[PDB]
Amino acid sequence: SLLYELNLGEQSFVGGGGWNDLYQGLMAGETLKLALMRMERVYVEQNSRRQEITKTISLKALLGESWPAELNKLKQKTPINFNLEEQIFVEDYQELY
Amino acid sequence: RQEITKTISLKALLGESWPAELNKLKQKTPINFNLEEQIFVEDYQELYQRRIKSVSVSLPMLVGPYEDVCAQLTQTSSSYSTRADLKHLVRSIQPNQQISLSTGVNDSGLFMLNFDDERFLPFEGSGVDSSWRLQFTNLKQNLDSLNDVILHVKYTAA
Amino acid sequence: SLALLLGVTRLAVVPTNNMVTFFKGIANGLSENVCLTTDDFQRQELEGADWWTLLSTNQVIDDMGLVLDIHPVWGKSDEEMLMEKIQSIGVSNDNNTLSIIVQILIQAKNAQENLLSQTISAEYGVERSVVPLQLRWLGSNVYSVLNQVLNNTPTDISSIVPKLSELTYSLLIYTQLINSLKLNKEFIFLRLTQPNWLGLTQPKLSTQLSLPEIYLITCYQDWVVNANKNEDS
């Protein structure tokens, strides 16, 4: 959830295999506290306001009048099919990384 | 501390010669600012100290709900790493923050937040001695009907 | 025992693959989240190392200049020498950007030393305060041992470098030199710092030992007990 919710590359804090079979799992919990400490500090640094943007589109404005005409099939027979390609979502607006 | 609220019009700030000169600044350049004392302090009751809390913008232009006000505001900024002695990226976010418009009304100046957050608001804890920019960006490809720009400020005096 | 300790008609030992399990144990202990700054540790222009790229808002110059390593000296060694060495090499920025990168480095030096001093103590039965001094007085360096991981020592072929396989053999004889008689680290620290000042001859800066030392260091180790006052006077 940390790496998805901040959209981040790998750091691998929670390593498997911490159990012990000479000493029947002794100390196999105190490592999880230090895993959470190593993890938490990524959130202490890597939170800030990213460039929040709001957008809207009309299908008539997107597709043009030939598609509201072709819609006389798509009313009954099929779904309507889309993809937010750059010529309306990005190139018509300020650029981004 | 002495919490104060303020507003200004660029037509009222600069005078009619700048809304005339704007026939260049529509396309070629940003518009360049500094909140100097003769409008921010000398036109108001005096103070020993001054620190910002919030800001926002409204845009007197002939734009409807069905269209996008893609302009930009900035305070002079850096994202750069300090190097001692011994013997940036494609419109990315500088850590000082730079607000991008959408509506052309004060909700283009801040989003969602009322009076609290986990984190400092735009320019919060700064003095007012800075310099600022307005830039239209891709809005300059349909800019045809702008008339004035309105700014709003929250700050504490002492 | 005395002939063995003097290195005449020396011991024989088998390079059992258990040694690889121990050196792979060091490599594992180095690799599991210790995240050590040992990445091309000493040599000049220390370029391309992760740690100061993250902290670059506080200081950029990860390459530094001349070397980042230490030789012990009596009375006071410690991080003040590591600070003075990096301060001497032409940094004109004498402000906090120089001092902060010392207090960032202290735990990163500990993270190189603490591995050997905590682990080999459980192999050979010596206190963690003796280990780095025993290692140098035997004729070794902590990084030189750690570099054998980079020389593929953790590979379970039945062969390893003499720099380990004879060092490990030599460690057992020098372990008997510190258990057939018992002595405290300050003696070793003086002996390692300044042999001619202690009272030896110049050739005994080398690892070699002979009876003219063994008489004098033993009769010292009696006299330090026999004297009418405590340790330090």
From Swiss-Prot, chain A:
Domain of life: Bacteria
Compartments reported by the entry: Secreted
Post-translational modification: The isolated toxin complex includes 3 peptides starting between residues 768 and 778 of this protein, which might be physiologically relevant.
Summary of the knockout phenotype: Cells with a disrupted yenA1-yenA2-chi2-yenB-yenC1-yenC2 locus are no longer pathogenic in C.zealandica larvae.
Reported function: Part of an orally active toxin complex (TC) with strong insecticidal effects on larvae of the Coleoptera Costelytra zealandica, Acrossidius tasmania and Adoryphorus couloni and some Lepidoptera larvae. The TC has an endochitinase activity.
The protein's assembly and partners: Semipurified toxin complex consists of at least YenA1-YenA2-YenB-YenC1-YenC2-Chi1-Chi2. The Yen-TC:K9 subcomplex is about 26 nm tall and 22 nm in diameter with 5-fold symmetry and 5 copies of YenA1, YenA2, Chi1 and Chi2; the chitinase subunits may be solvent accessible on the exterior the complex. The Yen-TC:K9 subcomplex has no insecticidal activity. The native complex with additional YenB, YenC1 and YenC2 subunits is 16 nm taller and is insecticidal; the toxicity-conferring subunits are present at about 1 copy each.
Protein name, UniProt field: Toxin subunit YenA2
Organism field: Yersinia entomophaga
Lineage: Bacteria, Pseudomonadati, Pseudomonadota, Gammaproteobacteria, Enterobacterales
From Swiss-Prot, chain B:
The record's account of how the chain is modified after translation: The isolated toxin complex includes 3 peptides starting between residues 768 and 778 of this protein, which might be physiologically relevant.
Reported phenotype of the disruption mutant: Cells with a disrupted yenA1-yenA2-chi2-yenB-yenC1-yenC2 locus are no longer pathogenic in C.zealandica larvae.
Intrachain disulfide bonds: none
Native species: Yersinia entomophaga
Cellular compartment(s): Secreted
Protein name: Toxin subunit YenA2
Function as written in the Swiss-Prot or TrEMBL entry: Part of an orally active toxin complex (TC) with strong insecticidal effects on larvae of the Coleoptera Costelytra zealandica, Acrossidius tasmania and Adoryphorus couloni and some Lepidoptera larvae. The TC has an endochitinase activity.
Subunit-structure text: Semipurified toxin complex consists of at least YenA1-YenA2-YenB-YenC1-YenC2-Chi1-Chi2. The Yen-TC:K9 subcomplex is about 26 nm tall and 22 nm in diameter with 5-fold symmetry and 5 copies of YenA1, YenA2, Chi1 and Chi2; the chitinase subunits may be solvent accessible on the exterior the complex. The Yen-TC:K9 subcomplex has no insecticidal activity. The native complex with additional YenB, YenC1 and YenC2 subunits is 16 nm taller and is insecticidal; the toxicity-conferring subunits are present at about 1 copy each.
Curated annotation (Swiss-Prot), chain C:
TM stretches of this protein: none
Source organism per UniProt: Yersinia entomophaga
Quaternary organization: Semipurified toxin complex consists of at least YenA1, YenA2, YenB, YenC1, YenC2, Chi1 and Chi2. The Yen-TC:K9 subcomplex is about 26 nm tall and 22 nm in diameter with 5-fold symmetry and 5 copies of YenA1, YenA2, Chi1 and Chi2; the chitinase subunits may be solvent accessible on the exterior the complex. The Yen-TC:K9 subcomplex has no insecticidal activity. The native complex with additional YenB, YenC1 and YenC2 subunits is 16 nm taller and is insecticidal; the toxicity-conferring subunits are present at about 1 copy each.
Residue numbers of the full-length protein present here: 816 to 1048 of 1164
Function: Part of an orally active toxin complex (TC) with strong insecticidal effects on larvae of the Coleoptera Costelytra zealandica, Acrossidius tasmania and Adoryphorus couloni and some Lepidoptera larvae. The TC has an endochitinase activity.
Effect of a null allele: Cells with a disrupted yenA1-yenA2-chi2-yenB-yenC1-yenC2 locus are no longer pathogenic in C.zealandica larvae.
Subcellular location: Secreted
Protein name (database record): Toxin subunit YenA1
